[PDB]
Amino acid sequence: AQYEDGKQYTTLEKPVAGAPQVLEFFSFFCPHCYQFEEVLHISDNVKKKLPEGVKMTKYHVNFMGGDLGKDLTQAWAVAMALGVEDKVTVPLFEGVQKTQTIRSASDIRDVFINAGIKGEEYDAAWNSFVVKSLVAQQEKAAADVQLRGVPAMFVNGKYQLNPQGMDTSNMDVFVQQYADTVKYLSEK
């Protein structure tokens, strides 16, 4: 076929029931993830080609960056809880991979402060059990698909995107192939 298993995507041997329709994993330490966000805008371009009524979920992972890695998973839960993902994603990426200004939990907190989240509000969220179970959800979702690499996208818990099998000579053409693949998988 034009879309073949093993080419634009692979199929999970052990399908995940009740998974989100589109499920993305990333790390703020992950170089391709930086690209996916800042240069490619994968998520936005996928969303634009997705059917009406499909929810899109994005989770952070712990297995890169040691202690700071877990702090970022907790901070991403704070972002999700407060709905401020779009305000902190870029400064977190640049602070980790570009400017080397994120070295502690307090430096992560600074990004949120600078973004306009109030100190009180961040600290309350950070310590909240709502944020605790959002951290749990992130860990268990990675567990459900037995993840060990990012960036990764899963469609209805059965199909994993395989960007290595797409053309990469043109950034825009790559993105469209990626998004058109998600749309195809979505309609499978």
Coordinates of N, CA, C and O in Angstrom, one line a residue:
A1 N 0.8 -1.2 0.0 CA 0.0 0.0 0.0 C 0.9 1.3 0.0 O 2.1 1.2 0.0
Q2 N 0.3 2.4 0.0 CA 1.0 3.7 0.1 C 1.5 3.8 1.5 O 2.6 4.2 1.8
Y3 N 0.6 3.6 2.4 CA 0.9 3.5 3.9 C 1.1 2.1 4.3 O 0.1 1.3 4.2
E4 N 2.3 1.8 4.7 CA 2.6 0.4 5.1 C 3.1 0.3 6.5 O 3.9 1.2 6.9
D5 N 2.7 -0.7 7.2 CA 3.3 -1.0 8.5 C 4.8 -1.3 8.3 O 5.2 -2.1 7.5
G6 N 5.6 -0.6 9.1 CA 7.0 -0.7 9.0 C 7.6 0.5 8.3 O 8.9 0.6 8.2
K7 N 6.8 1.3 7.6 CA 7.3 2.4 6.9 C 7.0 3.8 7.5 O 7.9 4.4 8.1
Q8 N 5.7 4.2 7.5 CA 5.4 5.5 8.1 C 5.0 5.3 9.5 O 4.9 6.2 10.3
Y9 N 4.8 4.0 9.9 CA 4.3 3.7 11.2 C 4.6 2.2 11.5 O 4.9 1.4 10.6
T10 N 4.4 1.8 12.8 CA 4.6 0.5 13.2 C 3.4 0.1 14.0 O 2.6 1.0 14.4
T11 N 3.1 -1.2 14.3 CA 1.9 -1.5 15.0 C 2.3 -2.1 16.3 O 3.1 -3.0 16.4
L12 N 1.7 -1.7 17.4 CA 1.9 -2.2 18.7 C 1.5 -3.7 18.8 O 0.3 -3.9 18.6
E13 N 2.4 -4.6 19.1 CA 2.1 -6.0 19.4 C 1.0 -6.1 20.5 O 0.2 -7.0 20.4
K14 N 1.0 -5.2 21.4 CA 0.1 -5.2 22.6 C -0.7 -4.0 22.7 O -0.3 -3.1 23.4
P15 N -1.7 -3.8 21.8 CA -2.6 -2.7 21.7 C -3.1 -2.2 23.1 O -3.4 -3.0 24.0
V16 N -3.2 -0.8 23.2 CA -3.6 -0.2 24.5 C -5.0 0.2 24.5 O -5.4 1.2 23.8
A17 N -5.9 -0.5 25.2 CA -7.3 -0.1 25.3 C -7.5 1.2 26.1 O -6.8 1.4 27.1
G18 N -8.5 2.0 25.6 CA -8.9 3.2 26.3 C -7.9 4.3 26.2 O -8.0 5.3 26.9
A19 N -6.8 4.1 25.4 CA -5.8 5.2 25.2 C -6.4 6.4 24.6 O -7.4 6.4 24.0
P20 N -5.7 7.6 24.8 CA -6.1 8.8 24.1 C -6.0 8.6 22.5 O -5.1 7.9 22.1
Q21 N -6.8 9.4 21.8 CA -6.8 9.2 20.3 C -5.5 9.5 19.7 O -5.0 8.7 18.9
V22 N -5.0 10.7 20.0 CA -3.6 11.0 19.7 C -2.8 11.3 20.9 O -3.1 12.3 21.7
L23 N -1.7 10.5 21.1 CA -0.9 10.6 22.3 C 0.6 10.8 22.0 O 1.2 9.9 21.3
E24 N 1.1 11.9 22.4 CA 2.4 12.3 22.1 C 3.3 12.3 23.4 O 2.8 12.7 24.4
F25 N 4.5 11.8 23.3 CA 5.5 11.9 24.4 C 6.7 12.7 24.0 O 7.2 12.6 22.8
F26 N 7.2 13.5 24.9 CA 8.4 14.3 24.6 C 9.3 14.4 25.9 O 8.8 14.1 27.0
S27 N 10.5 15.0 25.7 CA 11.3 15.5 26.9 C 11.8 16.9 26.5 O 12.2 17.1 25.4
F28 N 12.0 17.7 27.5 CA 12.6 19.0 27.3 C 14.1 18.9 27.0 O 14.7 19.8 26.6
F29 N 14.6 17.7 27.4 CA 16.0 17.4 27.1 C 16.2 16.8 25.7 O 17.4 16.5 25.3
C30 N 15.1 16.6 25.0 CA 15.2 15.7 23.8 C 15.4 16.6 22.5 O 14.5 17.4 22.2
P31 N 16.5 16.5 21.8 CA 16.9 17.4 20.7 C 15.9 17.4 19.6 O 15.5 18.4 19.1
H32 N 15.4 16.2 19.1 CA 14.4 16.1 18.1 C 13.1 16.7 18.6 O 12.3 17.3 17.8
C33 N 12.8 16.6 19.9 CA 11.6 17.2 20.4 C 11.6 18.7 20.3 O 10.6 19.4 20.0
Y34 N 12.8 19.3 20.5 CA 13.0 20.7 20.3 C 12.6 21.2 18.9 O 11.9 22.1 18.7
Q35 N 13.1 20.4 18.0 CA 12.8 20.6 16.6 C 11.3 20.4 16.3 O 10.7 21.3 15.7
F36 N 10.7 19.4 16.8 CA 9.3 19.1 16.6 C 8.5 20.2 17.1 O 7.4 20.5 16.6
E37 N 8.9 20.9 18.2 CA 8.1 22.0 18.7 C 8.4 23.3 18.0 O 7.6 23.9 17.4
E38 N 9.7 23.7 17.9 CA 10.1 25.0 17.6 C 10.2 25.3 16.1 O 10.0 26.4 15.7
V39 N 10.6 24.3 15.3 CA 10.9 24.4 13.9 C 9.8 23.8 13.1 O 9.4 24.3 12.0
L40 N 9.4 22.6 13.5 CA 8.4 21.8 12.7 C 7.0 22.1 13.1 O 6.1 22.1 12.3
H41 N 6.7 22.4 14.4 CA 5.3 22.6 15.0 C 4.5 21.3 14.6 O 3.3 21.5 14.1
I42 N 5.0 20.2 14.9 CA 4.3 18.9 14.6 C 2.9 18.9 15.2 O 1.9 18.6 14.4
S43 N 2.7 19.2 16.5 CA 1.4 19.1 17.1 C 0.4 20.0 16.4 O -0.8 19.5 16.2
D44 N 0.7 21.2 16.1 CA -0.2 22.1 15.6 C -0.6 21.7 14.2 O -1.8 21.7 13.8
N45 N 0.3 21.2 13.4 CA 0.0 20.8 12.0 C -0.8 19.5 12.0 O -1.6 19.3 11.1
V46 N -0.5 18.6 12.9 CA -1.4 17.4 13.1 C -2.8 17.8 13.4 O -3.7 17.3 12.8
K47 N -2.9 18.6 14.5 CA -4.2 19.1 14.9 C -5.1 19.6 13.7 O -6.3 19.3 13.6
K48 N -4.4 20.5 12.9 CA -5.1 21.1 11.8 C -5.6 20.1 10.7 O -6.5 20.4 10.0
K49 N -5.1 18.9 10.7 CA -5.5 17.9 9.7 C -6.4 16.8 10.3 O -6.9 15.9 9.6
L50 N -6.5 16.8 11.6 CA -7.3 15.8 12.3 C -8.8 16.1 12.2 O -9.2 17.3 12.1
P51 N -9.6 15.0 12.2 CA -11.0 15.1 12.2 C -11.5 16.0 13.3 O -10.8 16.4 14.2
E52 N -12.8 16.5 13.2 CA -13.5 17.1 14.3 C -13.6 16.1 15.4 O -13.9 14.9 15.1
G53 N -13.5 16.5 16.6 CA -13.8 15.7 17.8 C -12.7 14.8 18.3 O -13.0 13.9 19.1
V54 N -11.5 14.9 17.8 CA -10.4 14.1 18.3 C -9.6 14.9 19.3 O -9.2 16.0 19.0
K55 N -9.4 14.3 20.5 CA -8.6 15.0 21.5 C -7.1 14.6 21.3 O -6.8 13.5 21.0
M56 N -6.3 15.6 21.6 CA -4.9 15.5 21.5 C -4.2 15.6 22.9 O -4.4 16.6 23.5
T57 N -3.5 14.5 23.3 CA -2.8 14.6 24.6 C -1.3 14.6 24.5 O -0.7 13.9 23.6
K58 N -0.6 15.4 25.3 CA 0.9 15.4 25.2 C 1.6 15.3 26.6 O 1.3 16.1 27.5
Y59 N 2.4 14.3 26.8 CA 3.0 13.9 28.0 C 4.6 14.0 28.1 O 5.2 13.7 27.1
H60 N 5.1 14.5 29.2 CA 6.6 14.5 29.4 C 7.1 13.1 30.0 O 6.2 12.4 30.5
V61 N 8.3 12.8 29.8 CA 8.9 11.5 30.3 C 10.1 11.8 31.3 O 10.7 12.9 31.2
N62 N 10.4 10.8 32.1 CA 11.4 10.9 33.1 C 12.8 10.5 32.7 O 13.8 10.9 33.2
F63 N 12.9 9.6 31.6 CA 14.1 8.9 31.4 C 15.2 9.7 30.7 O 16.2 9.1 30.3
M64 N 15.1 11.0 30.6 CA 16.2 11.9 30.2 C 16.4 13.0 31.2 O 15.5 13.5 31.7
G65 N 17.7 13.2 31.5 CA 18.0 14.4 32.4 C 18.0 14.2 33.8 O 18.0 15.1 34.6
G66 N 17.9 12.9 34.3 CA 18.0 12.6 35.7 C 17.0 13.4 36.6 O 15.8 13.4 36.3
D67 N 17.5 14.0 37.7 CA 16.7 14.7 38.6 C 15.9 15.8 37.9 O 14.6 15.9 38.1
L68 N 16.5 16.6 37.1 CA 15.8 17.7 36.4 C 14.7 17.1 35.5 O 13.6 17.7 35.4
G69 N 15.0 16.0 34.9 CA 14.0 15.3 34.1 C 12.7 15.0 34.8 O 11.6 15.3 34.3
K70 N 12.8 14.5 36.0 CA 11.6 14.3 36.8 C 10.9 15.6 37.2 O 9.7 15.7 37.3
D71 N 11.7 16.6 37.5 CA 11.2 18.0 37.9 C 10.4 18.5 36.7 O 9.3 19.1 36.9
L72 N 10.8 18.2 35.5 CA 10.1 18.8 34.3 C 8.8 18.0 34.1 O 7.9 18.6 33.6
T73 N 8.8 16.7 34.4 CA 7.6 16.0 34.3 C 6.6 16.6 35.3 O 5.4 16.7 35.0
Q74 N 7.0 16.9 36.5 CA 6.1 17.5 37.5 C 5.6 18.9 37.0 O 4.5 19.2 37.2
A75 N 6.6 19.6 36.5 CA 6.2 21.0 36.0 C 5.3 20.9 34.8 O 4.5 21.8 34.6
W76 N 5.4 19.9 34.0 CA 4.5 19.7 32.8 C 3.1 19.4 33.3 O 2.1 19.9 32.8
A77 N 3.1 18.7 34.4 CA 1.8 18.4 35.1 C 1.2 19.7 35.6 O 0.0 20.0 35.4
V78 N 2.0 20.6 36.2 CA 1.5 21.9 36.6 C 1.0 22.7 35.4 O -0.1 23.2 35.4
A79 N 1.7 22.7 34.3 CA 1.3 23.3 33.1 C -0.1 22.8 32.6 O -1.0 23.6 32.3
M80 N -0.3 21.5 32.6 CA -1.5 20.9 32.2 C -2.7 21.2 33.1 O -3.8 21.6 32.7
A81 N -2.4 21.0 34.4 CA -3.4 21.5 35.5 C -3.8 22.9 35.3 O -5.0 23.2 35.5
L82 N -2.9 23.8 35.0 CA -3.3 25.3 34.9 C -3.6 25.7 33.5 O -4.1 26.9 33.3
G83 N -3.5 24.9 32.5 CA -3.7 25.1 31.1 C -2.8 26.2 30.5 O -3.2 27.0 29.7
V84 N -1.5 26.1 30.9 CA -0.6 27.1 30.4 C 0.6 26.5 29.6 O 1.6 27.1 29.4
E85 N 0.3 25.3 29.0 CA 1.3 24.7 28.1 C 1.8 25.6 27.1 O 3.0 25.6 26.8
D86 N 1.0 26.3 26.4 CA 1.4 27.1 25.3 C 2.3 28.3 25.7 O 3.0 28.9 24.9
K87 N 2.2 28.7 27.0 CA 3.0 29.8 27.5 C 4.4 29.4 28.0 O 5.3 30.2 28.1
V88 N 4.6 28.1 28.4 CA 5.9 27.7 29.0 C 6.7 26.7 28.1 O 7.9 26.5 28.4
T89 N 6.1 26.1 27.1 CA 6.8 25.1 26.3 C 8.1 25.6 25.7 O 9.1 25.0 25.8
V90 N 8.0 26.8 25.0 CA 9.1 27.3 24.4 C 10.2 27.8 25.4 O 11.4 27.4 25.2
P91 N 9.9 28.6 26.4 CA 10.9 29.0 27.3 C 11.6 27.8 28.1 O 12.7 27.9 28.5
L92 N 10.8 26.7 28.3 CA 11.4 25.5 28.9 C 12.4 24.9 28.0 O 13.5 24.5 28.4
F93 N 12.0 24.7 26.7 CA 13.0 24.2 25.7 C 14.2 25.0 25.6 O 15.4 24.5 25.6
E94 N 14.1 26.3 25.5 CA 15.3 27.2 25.3 C 16.1 27.2 26.6 O 17.4 27.2 26.5
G95 N 15.5 27.2 27.7 CA 16.2 27.2 29.0 C 17.0 25.9 29.2 O 18.1 26.0 29.8
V96 N 16.4 24.8 28.8 CA 17.2 23.5 28.9 C 18.2 23.4 27.8 O 19.4 23.0 28.1
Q97 N 17.8 23.5 26.5 CA 18.7 23.2 25.4 C 19.5 24.3 24.8 O 20.5 24.1 24.0
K98 N 19.1 25.6 24.9 CA 19.7 26.7 24.2 C 20.6 27.5 25.2 O 21.8 27.6 25.0
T99 N 19.9 28.1 26.2 CA 20.6 29.1 27.0 C 21.3 28.5 28.3 O 22.0 29.3 29.0
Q100 N 21.0 27.3 28.6 CA 21.6 26.6 29.8 C 21.3 27.4 31.1 O 22.2 27.7 31.9
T101 N 20.1 27.8 31.2 CA 19.7 28.6 32.4 C 18.7 27.8 33.3 O 18.3 28.3 34.3
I102 N 18.4 26.6 32.9 CA 17.6 25.8 33.7 C 18.4 24.6 34.3 O 18.7 23.7 33.7
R103 N 18.7 24.8 35.6 CA 19.7 23.9 36.3 C 19.0 23.4 37.6 O 19.6 22.5 38.3
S104 N 17.8 23.9 38.0 CA 17.2 23.5 39.2 C 15.7 23.6 39.1 O 15.2 24.3 38.2
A105 N 15.0 23.1 40.1 CA 13.5 23.2 40.1 C 13.1 24.7 40.2 O 12.1 25.1 39.7
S106 N 14.0 25.5 40.9 CA 13.7 26.9 41.1 C 13.8 27.6 39.8 O 12.9 28.5 39.5
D107 N 14.7 27.2 38.9 CA 14.8 27.8 37.6 C 13.7 27.5 36.7 O 13.2 28.3 35.8
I108 N 13.1 26.3 36.8 CA 11.9 25.9 36.1 C 10.8 26.8 36.6 O 10.0 27.4 35.8
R109 N 10.6 27.0 37.9 CA 9.6 27.8 38.5 C 9.7 29.3 37.9 O 8.7 29.9 37.6
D110 N 10.9 29.7 37.7 CA 11.1 31.1 37.1 C 10.5 31.3 35.7 O 10.0 32.4 35.4
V111 N 10.6 30.2 34.9 CA 9.9 30.3 33.6 C 8.4 30.6 33.7 O 7.8 31.3 32.9
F112 N 7.8 29.9 34.7 CA 6.3 30.1 34.9 C 6.1 31.5 35.4 O 5.1 32.1 35.1
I113 N 6.9 31.9 36.4 CA 6.8 33.3 36.9 C 6.9 34.3 35.8 O 6.0 35.1 35.6
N114 N 7.9 34.2 35.0 CA 8.2 35.1 33.9 C 7.0 35.1 32.9 O 6.6 36.1 32.3
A115 N 6.3 33.9 32.8 CA 5.2 33.7 31.9 C 3.9 34.3 32.4 O 2.9 34.3 31.7
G116 N 3.9 34.7 33.7 CA 2.7 35.3 34.2 C 1.9 34.5 35.2 O 0.8 34.9 35.6
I117 N 2.3 33.2 35.4 CA 1.7 32.4 36.4 C 2.1 33.0 37.8 O 3.3 33.3 37.9
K118 N 1.2 33.1 38.7 CA 1.6 33.7 40.0 C 2.2 32.7 40.9 O 1.8 31.5 41.0
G119 N 3.2 33.1 41.7 CA 4.0 32.3 42.5 C 3.2 31.4 43.4 O 3.4 30.2 43.5
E120 N 2.3 32.0 44.1 CA 1.3 31.3 44.9 C 0.7 30.2 44.2 O 0.5 29.0 44.7
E121 N 0.2 30.5 42.9 CA -0.5 29.5 42.1 C 0.3 28.4 41.7 O -0.1 27.2 41.7
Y122 N 1.6 28.7 41.3 CA 2.5 27.6 40.9 C 2.8 26.7 42.0 O 2.6 25.5 41.9
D123 N 3.2 27.2 43.1 CA 3.6 26.4 44.3 C 2.4 25.6 44.8 O 2.7 24.4 45.2
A124 N 1.2 26.1 44.8 CA 0.0 25.3 45.2 C -0.2 24.2 44.3 O -0.4 23.0 44.7
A125 N -0.1 24.4 43.0 CA -0.3 23.4 41.9 C 0.8 22.3 42.1 O 0.6 21.1 42.2
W126 N 2.1 22.8 42.2 CA 3.2 21.9 42.3 C 3.1 20.9 43.4 O 3.4 19.7 43.2
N127 N 2.4 21.3 44.5 CA 2.3 20.5 45.7 C 1.0 19.8 45.7 O 0.8 18.9 46.6
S128 N 0.1 20.1 44.8 CA -1.2 19.5 44.8 C -1.3 18.0 44.4 O -0.4 17.5 43.6
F129 N -2.3 17.3 44.9 CA -2.5 15.9 44.6 C -3.2 15.8 43.2 O -3.2 14.7 42.6
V130 N -3.7 16.9 42.7 CA -4.2 16.9 41.3 C -2.9 16.8 40.4 O -2.9 16.0 39.5
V131 N -1.9 17.5 40.7 CA -0.6 17.4 39.9 C 0.0 16.1 40.1 O 0.6 15.5 39.2
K132 N -0.1 15.5 41.4 CA 0.5 14.2 41.7 C -0.1 13.2 40.8 O 0.6 12.3 40.3
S133 N -1.4 13.2 40.6 CA -2.0 12.1 39.8 C -1.8 12.4 38.3 O -1.9 11.5 37.5
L134 N -1.6 13.7 37.9 CA -1.2 13.9 36.5 C 0.2 13.4 36.2 O 0.5 13.0 35.1
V135 N 1.1 13.4 37.2 CA 2.4 12.8 37.1 C 2.2 11.3 36.9 O 2.9 10.7 36.1
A136 N 1.4 10.7 37.7 CA 1.1 9.3 37.6 C 0.5 8.9 36.2 O 0.8 7.9 35.7
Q137 N -0.4 9.8 35.7 CA -1.0 9.5 34.4 C 0.1 9.5 33.3 O 0.1 8.6 32.4
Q138 N 1.0 10.5 33.3 CA 2.1 10.5 32.4 C 2.9 9.3 32.5 O 3.3 8.7 31.5
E139 N 3.3 8.9 33.7 CA 4.1 7.6 33.9 C 3.4 6.4 33.4 O 4.0 5.6 32.7
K140 N 2.1 6.3 33.7 CA 1.4 5.1 33.3 C 1.2 5.0 31.8 O 1.3 4.0 31.2
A141 N 1.0 6.2 31.2 CA 0.8 6.2 29.7 C 2.1 5.7 29.1 O 2.0 4.9 28.1
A142 N 3.2 6.2 29.5 CA 4.5 5.7 28.9 C 4.6 4.2 29.1 O 5.0 3.4 28.2
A143 N 4.2 3.8 30.3 CA 4.2 2.3 30.7 C 3.3 1.5 29.7 O 3.6 0.4 29.3
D144 N 2.1 2.0 29.5 CA 1.1 1.3 28.7 C 1.6 1.0 27.3 O 1.2 0.0 26.7
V145 N 2.5 1.8 26.7 CA 3.0 1.5 25.4 C 4.4 1.1 25.4 O 5.1 1.0 24.4
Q146 N 4.9 0.8 26.6 CA 6.3 0.5 26.9 C 7.3 1.4 26.1 O 7.8 0.9 25.1
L147 N 7.2 2.7 26.4 CA 8.0 3.7 25.7 C 9.5 3.6 26.1 O 9.7 3.4 27.3
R148 N 10.4 3.9 25.2 CA 11.8 4.2 25.6 C 12.5 5.1 24.6 O 13.7 5.1 24.5
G149 N 11.7 5.8 23.8 CA 12.3 6.8 23.0 C 11.3 7.9 22.7 O 10.1 7.7 22.6
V150 N 11.8 9.2 22.6 CA 11.0 10.3 22.2 C 11.7 11.1 21.1 O 12.9 11.0 21.0
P151 N 11.0 11.9 20.3 CA 9.5 12.2 20.3 C 8.8 10.9 19.9 O 9.3 10.2 19.1
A152 N 7.6 10.7 20.4 CA 6.8 9.5 20.0 C 5.4 9.9 19.9 O 4.9 10.7 20.8
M153 N 4.7 9.4 18.9 CA 3.2 9.6 18.9 C 2.5 8.3 18.6 O 3.0 7.4 17.9
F154 N 1.4 8.1 19.3 CA 0.6 6.9 19.2 C -0.8 7.2 18.8 O -1.3 8.2 19.4
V155 N -1.4 6.5 17.9 CA -2.7 6.7 17.5 C -3.7 5.6 18.0 O -3.5 4.4 17.7
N156 N -4.7 6.0 18.7 CA -5.7 5.2 19.4 C -5.0 4.0 20.1 O -5.6 2.9 20.1
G157 N -3.9 4.2 20.7 CA -3.1 3.2 21.3 C -2.8 1.9 20.5 O -2.4 0.9 21.1
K158 N -2.9 2.0 19.2 CA -2.5 0.8 18.4 C -1.4 1.1 17.4 O -0.6 0.1 17.1
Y159 N -1.2 2.3 17.0 CA -0.2 2.7 15.9 C 0.8 3.7 16.4 O 0.4 4.8 16.9
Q160 N 2.1 3.5 16.2 CA 3.1 4.4 16.5 C 3.7 5.0 15.3 O 4.0 4.3 14.3
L161 N 3.8 6.3 15.2 CA 4.4 7.0 14.1 C 5.8 6.7 13.9 O 6.6 6.5 14.9
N162 N 6.3 6.5 12.7 CA 7.7 6.2 12.4 C 8.4 7.2 11.5 O 8.6 7.0 10.3
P163 N 8.8 8.4 12.1 CA 9.3 9.5 11.2 C 10.6 9.1 10.4 O 10.8 9.7 9.4
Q164 N 11.4 8.1 10.9 CA 12.6 7.7 10.2 C 12.3 7.2 8.8 O 13.2 7.2 7.9
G165 N 11.1 6.7 8.6 CA 10.7 6.3 7.3 C 9.9 7.3 6.4 O 9.3 6.9 5.4
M166 N 10.1 8.6 6.7 CA 9.5 9.6 5.9 C 10.7 10.4 5.3 O 11.8 10.3 5.7
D167 N 10.4 11.2 4.3 CA 11.4 12.0 3.6 C 11.7 13.3 4.4 O 10.8 13.9 5.0
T168 N 13.0 13.6 4.5 CA 13.5 14.7 5.4 C 14.3 15.8 4.7 O 15.0 16.6 5.3
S169 N 14.2 15.8 3.4 CA 14.8 16.8 2.6 C 14.2 18.1 2.6 O 14.9 19.2 2.5
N170 N 12.9 18.1 2.9 CA 12.1 19.4 3.0 C 11.4 19.3 4.3 O 10.6 18.4 4.6
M171 N 11.7 20.3 5.2 CA 11.0 20.3 6.5 C 9.4 20.3 6.3 O 8.8 19.6 7.0
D172 N 8.9 21.1 5.4 CA 7.4 21.2 5.3 C 6.8 19.9 4.7 O 5.8 19.4 5.2
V173 N 7.5 19.3 3.8 CA 7.0 18.1 3.2 C 7.0 17.0 4.3 O 6.1 16.1 4.3
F174 N 8.1 16.9 5.1 CA 8.1 16.0 6.2 C 6.9 16.1 7.1 O 6.2 15.1 7.4
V175 N 6.6 17.3 7.5 CA 5.5 17.6 8.4 C 4.2 17.1 7.8 O 3.4 16.5 8.5
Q176 N 4.0 17.4 6.6 CA 2.7 17.1 5.9 C 2.6 15.5 5.9 O 1.5 15.0 6.0
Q177 N 3.7 14.9 5.6 CA 3.7 13.4 5.5 C 3.4 12.9 6.9 O 2.6 11.9 7.1
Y178 N 3.9 13.5 7.9 CA 3.7 13.1 9.3 C 2.3 13.2 9.6 O 1.6 12.3 10.2
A179 N 1.7 14.4 9.3 CA 0.3 14.7 9.7 C -0.7 13.9 8.9 O -1.7 13.4 9.4
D180 N -0.4 13.8 7.6 CA -1.3 12.9 6.8 C -1.2 11.5 7.2 O -2.2 10.8 7.1
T181 N -0.1 11.1 7.7 CA 0.0 9.7 8.3 C -0.9 9.6 9.6 O -1.7 8.6 9.7
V182 N -0.9 10.6 10.4 CA -1.7 10.5 11.6 C -3.2 10.5 11.2 O -4.0 9.7 11.8
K183 N -3.5 11.3 10.2 CA -4.9 11.4 9.8 C -5.4 10.0 9.2 O -6.4 9.5 9.6
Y184 N -4.5 9.4 8.4 CA -4.8 8.1 7.9 C -5.0 7.1 9.0 O -6.0 6.3 9.0
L185 N -4.1 7.0 10.0 CA -4.2 6.1 11.1 C -5.4 6.4 11.9 O -6.1 5.4 12.4
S186 N -5.7 7.6 12.1 CA -6.9 8.0 12.8 C -8.2 7.4 12.2 O -9.2 7.2 12.9
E187 N -8.2 7.3 10.9 CA -9.4 6.9 10.2 C -9.4 5.3 9.9 O -10.4 4.8 9.4
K188 N -8.3 4.7 10.3 CA -8.1 3.3 10.3 C -9.1 2.6 11.2 O -8.7 1.9 12.1

